[PDB]
Structures are given as structure tokens and as C-alpha cells.
């Protein structure tokens, strides 16, 4: 239910201490690959130690440099290797050099009131990672990510990506009003997702994600999203994207489905609203402040 590292990764924790992950030394491409038997974050959060010097974290107070490091990471991957899902709540803080965060658990991830500090970008995935130097591929064949009512605060990220077999959106994903707005991508289905290009290519899996007509992405009214660009992608044939949570974006909303699309309200201030599905595509009220709206089943 906690944090149980493997290999060179260490976790400084104990009682009331905010846990500090002494991440593994990164490879030549800047990726620190950290395997865990169990990975969970609870309020107030966790500190990833990407520090070559002693200092102070915002949520955790004083800490020393990470003894594993000969250089700082540009991407920190936490991969769960055993059978338990991950729960994430609180702040994911990177102490030291800012880096991409990737949390991968094929068993599932649930998210409730998540934020970040000094993370460049954040990816939550049920894909199994393949790491080759700087190149990270995520092979999604199973698992659900659920955003619970507490939601995600993406403020300060370039993007927040959720990449899983199925995705449930039951809380808001947004950046704070007037602050640097993150892009949001939700990518469902059996895919290889390349972390550097943020492109999904469909792959074979051992089982279906769900039945024909079931929803690969299912957002309720509580799952409202606000992002610089918002992209929703479902690649499994016959599965739907349902997102009843209002979508709001300054620059683009794009939905691609290999089945149905069913949206509520969606608005883009200065850019295109594009819906492309294999099945029936429907939307409640659409608006674009400079009118690019395309809908195509």
C-alpha cells in the first residue's frame, strides 16, 4: 500500500516523514528507470530526489543529495513490477533538476487530488515500458486509470498524458485559472505509445479492452477538462469515447475514436474542434470563438 523499491532505487521514509525517492542513476539518454514492487503516493505527496546537492524540498523539507546520481535525470520513470495497482494523491515534487515524470503500472492507477512541482511533464500509464537509452515506449495491453473526484491539477506541466487500456474520468483535469496551461491527452486502447513523439500506434493484445459498444474513455459530468490543447484518442475497434464532462480549451479539442463518440459541451477559444469516429459521433453544444468545427463518423 506504500512504496517498495527494487534495484538501486531507495526510499527514505518512516513514520511522519514525506517519502523521498532516491531514484536510480539515469542512463546515457537521461532516463532514470526505477522499478518498484509497490508504488503509491498519499498526501502530502512524494519527493523525487534529482539533486546533486543538499537542500530543501517544498513539501518534504530538508534532504541530502541523492547518493545514486552521477548526473541528473531528464525523465524519471517509476514502473511497478508486481501485481498491485497504484494510488496517487498529493504533490509529486521533483527536487533538483526538473524532469519528466512517468508512472507506469499495468495493474491500474487511481488518482485523487494530484498535483506536481518541478515536473516538466507527467504521464500516467498502464503500459509496460521498454527503455532504450533516451527512447521510452509504453506498450499498453491492459489496465485502467481512474481519475477520482479530487481530480488533477496540471498547472506547471507542458502536458499531462493518461495512457491506458481504459480510462474513467470522474474528476476534473485542469490548470489553475490564468496560470500556465498544460495540454491534456487521454489515449485509450491497445497501443504502443512513444514517449518522445506522443504518438500512439495500435498493437495486438491478448484480450479485448471491453465489449463492442463499451466505453474505452468514460467521463462523467465531474470529469470536466481545461487544457491548452485537449486530445482524446481511443484506438480499439468498436469501443466508444464518452465524455459528458465539459471540455474547454484555448487552442484545440481533438477526439479520435475507432467506435462511438458522445460528448457534452465542448468549446475552443481560438482553434479547431475536431471529432472523428468510426461509429456514431454526437456532441451536446459545440462552440469555437473563431469557428473551426468538424464532426465525422
From Swiss-Prot:
Disulphide-bridged cysteine pairs: none
Subcellular location: Cell surface
Physiological role: Evidence for a role in host-cell binding and infection.
Protein name: Filamentous hemagglutinin
Gene: fhaB
Full-protein residues shown: 72 to 368 of 3590
Amino acid at each position: 500500500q506504500g512504496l517498495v523499491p527494487q534495484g538501486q532505487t531507495q526510499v527514505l521514509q518512516g513514520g511522519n516523514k514525506v517519502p523521498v525517492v532516491n531514484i536510480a542513476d539515469p542512463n546515457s539518454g537521461g532516463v532514470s528507470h526505477n522499478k518498484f514492487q509497490q508504488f503509491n503516493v498519499a498526501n502530502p505527496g512524494v519527493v523525487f530526489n534529482n539533486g546533486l546537492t543538499d537542500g530543501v524540498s517544498r513539501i518534504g523539507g530538508a534532504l541530502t543529495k541523492n547518493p545514486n546520481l552521477t548526473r541528473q535525470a531528464s525523465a524519471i520513470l517509476a514502473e511497478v513490477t508486481d501485481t498491485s495497482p497504484s494510488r496517487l494523491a498529493g504533490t509529486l515534487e521533483v527536487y533538483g533538476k526538473g524532469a519528466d515524470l512517468i508512472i507506469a503500472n499495468p495493474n491500474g492507477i487511481s488518482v485523487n487530488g494530484l498535483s506536481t512541482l518541478n515536473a516538466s511533464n507527467l504521464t500516467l500509464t498502464t503500459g509496460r515500458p521498454s527503455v532504450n537509452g533516451g527512447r521510452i515506449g509504453l506498450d499498453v495491453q491492459q489496465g485502467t486509470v481512474t481519475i477520482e473526484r479530487g481530480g488533477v491539477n496540471a498547472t506547471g506541466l507542458g502536458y499531462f498524458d493518461v495512457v491506458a487500456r481504459l480510462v474513467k474520468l470522474q474528476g476534473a483535469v485542469s490548470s489553475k485559472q490564468g496560470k500556465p496551461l498544460a495540454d491534456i491527452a487521454v489515449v485509450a486502447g491497445a497501443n504502443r505509445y512513444d514517449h518522445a513523439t506522443r504518438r500512439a500506434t495500435p498493437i495486438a493484445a491478448g484480450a479485448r479492452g471491453a465489449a463492442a459498444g463499451a466505453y474505452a474513455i468514460d467521463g462523467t459530468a465531474a470529469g470536466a477538462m481545461y487544457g491548452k490543447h485537449i486530445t482524446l484518442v481511443s484506438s480499439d475497434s468498436g469501443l466508444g469515447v464518452r465524455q459528458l464532462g465539459s471540455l474547454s480549451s484555448p487552442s484545440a479539442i481533438t477526439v479520435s475514436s475507432q467506435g462511438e463518440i458522445a460528448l457534452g459541451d465542448a468549446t475552443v477559444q481560438r482553434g479547431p474542434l475536431s471529432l472523428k469516429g468510426a461509429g456514431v459521433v454526437s456532441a451536446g453544444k459545440l462552440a469555437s470563438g473563431g469557428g473551426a468545427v468538424n464532426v465525422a463518423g
